[PDB]
Ligand SMILES: *[C@@H]1O[C@H](CO)[C@@H](O[C@@H]2O[C@H](CO)[C@@H](O)[C@H](O)[C@H]2NC(C)=O)[C@H](O)[C@H]1NC(C)=O
């Protein structure tokens with residue numbers, strides 16, 4: 001808005017993009033990868049993590065025997081991101 | 090990458106200044122609800138499915154493949170065992186019928 005220059009607003013508002021990501025995140029948390037293929041089919045998140053361990057080659061019992069430890073690692077790892085973002089410039 | 094759904098195959102077709110792919114994909118439909126559990130406690134051992142999941146239509150437990158509901162009885166040749174079942178959360182008690190015991194009991 002100075003002399004002949006205008007900045008057009010993006011079609012998708014920031015709130016709409018946040019809603020998109022929230023939808024994707026809820027889908028991946030609740031239904032695993034089924035929602036991308038088609039109808040969203042829900043699996044308990046532990047069993048889905050077991051699916052994914054089978055995907056990377058580790059057998060699924062490894063998750064169930066170690067589910068609490070894996071949960072703690074994931075929670076602390078997410079916690080580290082907050083420090084990294086808030087403090088590191 | 091190639092269509093929405095699990096990719097089966099795809100065919101090319103010539104276009105004037107480009108190419109048109111016909112992507113043949115498999116889309117699951119007509120889903121059904123089931124009760125589920127990670128393991129099965131039997132004789133103090135935890136049985137996990139080899140490939141598939143444990144599904145129950147309320148009162149009977151089965152093994153199915155994850156993408157097409159084709160139920161089969163829980164048996165020792167399609168579920169493996171890993172330790173006892175005090176560590177798993179979500180265990181359900183049920184019988185894991187083994188195929189050698191009926192043949193041996195016929196003796
Ligand atoms: C699996 O069960 C869930 C829960 O019973 C179903 O979700 C509900 O279905 C009813 C009837 O269609 C709706 O009125 C509710 O709004 C649904 N959501 C709830 C209760 O949170 C789900 O439809 C079932 N899936 C199939 C394929 O039948």
Ligand SMILES: *[C@@H]1O[C@H](CO)[C@@H](O[C@@H]2O[C@H](CO)[C@@H](O)[C@H](O)[C@H]2NC(C)=O)[C@H](O)[C@H]1NC(C)=O
Nearest residue numbers: 123144145146147148149150151160161162163
């Ligand atoms: C859950 O599935 C089981 C599958 O075994 C059903 O049990 C059998 O159902 C058939 C068909 O009705 C009967 O002929 C059998 O006698 C039943 N028992 C056995 C041991 O095979 C069971 O009825 C289903 N339950 C519900 C609520 O659908």
Ligand SMILES: *[C@@H]1O[C@H](CO)[C@@H](O[C@@H]2O[C@H](CO)[C@@H](O)[C@H](O)[C@H]2NC(C)=O)[C@H](O)[C@H]1NC(C)=O
Nearest residue numbers: 044045046047125126127128177178179180181
């Ligand atoms: C799945 O969630 C249910 C929630 O109802 C668990 O059953 C118990 O439900 C009562 C209802 O008041 C809660 O107070 C308990 O805390 C629940 N138990 C637990 C261990 O959370 C059920 O146990 C859960 N299943 C699994 C495998 O965790």
Ligand SMILES: *[C@@H]1O[C@H](CO)[C@@H](O[C@@H]2O[C@H](CO)[C@@H](O)[C@H](O)[C@H]2NC(C)=O)[C@H](O)[C@H]1NC(C)=O
Nearest residue numbers: 129130131132133134174175179180181182183
């Ligand atoms: C599956 O079977 C086991 C074996 O009996 C059950 O464990 C019993 O639980 C009761 C109540 O907690 C105890 O009084 C018994 O001492 C336990 N038995 C053994 C051998 O430890 C278990 O409760 C069963 N699963 C369910 C869901 O009832």
